[PDB]
C-alpha cells in the first residue's frame, strides 16, 4: 500500500515543474545568455565593453547600464526570463594581457531555487573563459580592419605581413569551433533527451560538469596554460597596428613555435580522455 | 599475457530471472564465449590470408603454403562445423522442453542439462582433445602471421621456419586421428 | 556492402531483373517504399541497398551503356523511379577497341560516380560486375573499368557474372577477339562466375526475360547468406577463400506452372542433383578443384553428414590427386512462398572449364591466320599501330590453359 | 545591416531576383506585408530589410541605371510596390569613359540617397555591389561609386558580385577596356565574388531568369548565417577574415523537376562535391588559398570531422607550401521546403583565377597595339588628353598577376 503511492507523488511532482513552472524553459534560456549561445548578444555585449579599453568602466552607472542597452540589441528575449541578469563584478582592477575579470549571475525565485543549486557559480567559471575568447575575434578583427584603410602600397613587406594574420586567425577560429561543438551541442544533446525529483539535482549536476570538455579541469590544466601563450602573442600583435616590422616578425615566429609545441603536448596526453581526442583532429589536419 | 586471454562478457540480469541466472550458471556461459570467440578469431584470421594468396596472383616451394593452408583450413572450418549443429540442436531441445511441461521445476533442470551438454559436447571438458586442438589454434597464428609479415617468397629463413610446423602439425594432425578412433562420431565423419 | 557495375544491353537487363528479385525478396516496394508487413523486418538491407531520408531505399547500382534505348525502356518500367538518376549514365551519341577507346575518353564521370557511391559505405567489401564478353559495349567497357579499378582500389574484391557467347549457334561475328581480350583482362585483374547462353537455354528448355530471371536467381542465391547473416560464411571473402573460374547450378529451377509435382525433397537428393553435368548451367581425366553447396530451408546437419558420407563412398565425384567440399546453410526470406521444402545452389571450380578457352582460342586462331574483320580495329588508337595486344592476350590465355 | 548597390541591366535584374529569393525565405509578401504564419518569426530581418510604420518591410536597396526600360519593367512586376520609389534613380535621358563621366556628373543625388539609407541603420557593416564589368553602365558607374565610396566611408566593407564577360562566346566588343579598368578599381578599392556567364551557363545546361536565379541563390546562401544568427560566424567581417578574389559553388543546384532523385545526401558527399572544378561556377601547379563550406540542414559535427579527416587523407586538394579550411553550419529558413536533407555552399580563394586576367590582358594587349575603338573614349574628358589611365590599370593588373 506504500509503493503504489510513491510513484504517483513523484510523477506528479516532476510534472508540476514542467507544465506549470517551465523548468524546461529556464535551462534553454540561461544558455541563451550565460553560455552566449544567442548571437547578436555576446557580439553586442563584448563589443561594447571592448570599445573602452580603471576608475571608469567600474561604477554601476556604465556596466549596470550596458546590459540594459545590450538586451535591446538581442532580438531574442525581453521576457520575464530575460530579467534578473545582474551584470556584477568580483574584483577591482588596477591597470596587453588577456584577462578582464567580470561575472554574470542569473537569479531565480523560491520553487526553482531548490533545484538549481547556488553552487551550480560554476557557470561563472566557464563564462569568463568564453568571454575571453571573444576578445580575440574582436581584437584580431580590428587589425584585419585596421590594415584595410592602409590600402598602392603593395610590396613584399606588406603581403608577407598579412599572411601572419590569416595564419594566426585560423588557430582561433578552430579552437572556437571546438568549443561550439562540445559545450553547446553534444553536451546539450544529453540532458535534453535525458530528462524526458532527486534525479533533477544529479542530472543537472552532470550536465554542467561542460566544464570537463571545456579544458577548465585541473587534470588537463597544462593544456590550458599553453593557450595563454597563444592569446598573449596575438594581443601584442594588435599593439603594433613598416617602422617596426622586424619587431613583429619575431613575434610571429614565437607563435609558430608554441603552436608546434601544443601538438606534441596534446599527443603525449592521449595515452593517459576521449574528449581530448577530437582536439587533435581539429588542430591537426594535413600537417604534423 | 595476451589481452584476448582475459576477455569476457558479463550480463546485468533483471529482477524476475534473478533466480534462474545465478553467478554460477552465468559463469559457465562465459567460458563458452571465451573459447567460441577464439575459434572465430583464428578462422576470420586464417581466411584473410586466403584473401591474399588468391589476391597474390601475378616459386616451386612457395606453393607449399596453400598445400598447408587448406590442410589447416579444412581441419578448422569443419571443426567450426559441428558447432552450428551442436548449438542449433541442443538449443532446439532446450526450447522444446520449455513449451511442453507446464511445470517450472523442469526448466531449472532442462536448462541446467542444456548447459552441461555444451561443456561436454564441445570437448571443452575433455582434457586430451582440448589440450591437442589448442596447439592447432595458436599454430595458425604463427602461419598466418608468416604469410602476412612479408610480401616476397619464403627465403629469409621463412622456409626454414615453414618446415618446422608441418613436422609438428602433420604430427599433431594424425595424433588427433588416433584419439577419436559417443560424441566424436558426429565430428570425425565430416573430416573423413 | 557492395557495388554493381553492369554494362551493355546484357548487363543492363541482368541488373534490372537482379534488382527485381532483390526487391521481391526484401519486401521493397517498386517505388522504393517498404511494405507494412515488412516494417519490423530483420533482414539486412545495407548490403545491396542504402535507405534515404524519404524512407525509400536506393540500390548501390550504376547503369552504363553505349546506347540509350535499353535504359530508356528501363526507366519506363514500374521500377523506374527506384534507381538513382544521378548514378545512371548514358552516352550522348560492336567493337572491343572502340569500347576501350570510349572508356579512356569517359574516365572522369564514371569514376566520379563510383567514388560518390563508394564514400557512402563504411565497410565496402568488393565489386560485382555483370556484362557480356562478346558484344562491343560490355567487353571493352568492362575491360577498361576492370583495369582502372584494380589500379584505383587495390584492396577491394572484384566479382563478375560474365556471359559467354553461344557456340553451337554460330551472335557477334567478331566475338573471338572481344572474348579473348576480355579473358585476358579477367585473368590479369579479376578476383573471381562463367555464364553461357548455350547450356543456359538448354536447361531452360529441358525470351531473355526468363533466361535472365534464372541468372538473377543464381546471383541472389549466391549472395543470400551475406544478405541474411547467420553463424558461418558471413562475408564474401569467406566465400572466395573457400574456393580459390567457376560454374554454377541450381536445383529448384522450376516454372511457376511446374509446382504441381511437390516432390518430397530431402537435402541428400538436392546436393546430389547439384553434381550432375546436366545441372551445371554452362556447356584428360578432367576433375574438380572445389565445390560449395548453399542450402535454403529446414536442414538437419545429421542429414548433411549422411549425404556427404554416402556421396563420398559412392565416389560420384573426382578430385585433384595433389590436394585434399563445403556445405553451407542459410535461411529463406520470410516473404516469398516456400514452394520448395529444401533447395540447393552449387558453385564449383572444375578443370573441364578449360575447354571453353580451347574453343575460343581455336576460334581466334581460325581467324588471325587470315586477318578477318581487322579493318575497324585499326581505326582505333589502341590497334592503330600494331596488334601486339592480341598476341599477348592469346599467349596469356594459352598460359592459363597450360596451368589448368 | 548592409546596403546593396546594383548597376546596369545585369545588376538591376540580379537585385530583382535576389530580393525575390529573400522575400521568399523570410515570408515577406510581395507588397511588403507579412504572412500570418510568419507573424511570430524568429528570423532576423534588419540585415536586409527595415520595417515601416505601415508594418511593411522595405529593402535597403538602391536602383541605378543609365536607361529606364529595365527598371520600368521591374515596377510593372507584382513586386513593384515593395521597393522604395525615393531610392530608385533613373537617368532622365556602352562605354566605360562615358559611365565614369556621368558618375562625376550625378554625384550629388546618388550620395544623397546613400546617406539617407545609411543614417537609418545603427550597425551598418559593409556594402554589397552587383554589376557587370563589360557593359558601359555597370563598369563605369561601379568604378565611380567604388572610388567615391572608399573615399567617403573608410570604415565599411565593400563586397561585390562582379559578372565577367563570356570568352568562348566572342558580348561587348569593347569589353577588354571596361573589364581592365573595372579590375583596376576593384583591386585599388574593393574589400572583397567573381562571376562569369560561360561556366555559369555551362553548369545550368549540364533565360537570364534562371541564370540569375542561380546567382541569387548563391548570394542568399552566402548571407544565410548572417541572416540567421547562430554561435559562430555572426558577422560579415568574420567571413572575410577567414578567407583573405573568390569563386563559388553550390551543390543542390537542381531544377524544380529534378527532385525525383531524392539521393541520400550526407554532409561528406556534399562537401566533397563542392571541391570539384565542375561545380566551381567560374570557368604552374596552381593551388588553393582558402576554402569555406557553409552547410544547411541537420548536421552532426562528428560527420563533419570524419569527412574532413577522409578528405585530408585522400589529398584531393592542394595548398600553398608557405602557409597553414573552414566548415560552418547554419539553419534553413523554416518556410521553404527542405527538399534536400543537407545542402552545401562553398566559397574559396584559389590561385588559378589568375588565368582570367591573363586572358583579358591578352585580349587588351591584342587591341592596344592597333588602337581599336578608341574614338569614343577620346570624346570623354577623362580620356580627352591621353590614356595614361589605361597604362596604369594594365600595369596594376600585371602586378596583381605577378603577386598571385
PDB file of C-alpha atoms in Angstrom, chain A residues 37-39 144 149 166 180-181 285-286, chain D residues 154 188 229-231 234 241 244 301 312:
ATOM      1  CA  UNK A  37      24.566  30.705 -27.416  1.00  0.00           C
ATOM      2  CA  UNK A  38      22.372  33.518 -28.764  1.00  0.00           C
ATOM      3  CA  UNK A  39      24.392  35.627 -31.176  1.00  0.00           C
ATOM      4  CA  UNK A 144      42.118  42.961 -40.081  1.00  0.00           C
ATOM      5  CA  UNK A 149      42.479  51.543 -44.598  1.00  0.00           C
ATOM      6  CA  UNK A 166      45.468  34.579 -41.715  1.00  0.00           C
ATOM      7  CA  UNK A 180      30.951  25.480 -30.216  1.00  0.00           C
ATOM      8  CA  UNK A 181      30.699  21.697 -30.612  1.00  0.00           C
ATOM      9  CA  UNK A 285      44.600  18.334 -40.483  1.00  0.00           C
ATOM     10  CA  UNK A 286      47.044  17.613 -43.330  1.00  0.00           C
TER      11      UNK A 286
ATOM     12  CA  UNK D 154      36.830  54.480 -44.899  1.00  0.00           C
ATOM     13  CA  UNK D 188      42.510  49.527 -55.665  1.00  0.00           C
ATOM     14  CA  UNK D 229      22.205  34.169 -36.082  1.00  0.00           C
ATOM     15  CA  UNK D 230      23.860  31.140 -34.534  1.00  0.00           C
ATOM     16  CA  UNK D 231      27.018  30.621 -32.480  1.00  0.00           C
ATOM     17  CA  UNK D 234      27.927  36.002 -36.712  1.00  0.00           C
ATOM     18  CA  UNK D 241      38.869  37.442 -42.173  1.00  0.00           C
ATOM     19  CA  UNK D 244      41.536  36.974 -47.150  1.00  0.00           C
ATOM     20  CA  UNK D 301      29.880  17.623 -36.148  1.00  0.00           C
ATOM     21  CA  UNK D 312      42.659  15.332 -45.855  1.00  0.00           C
TER      22      UNK D 312
END
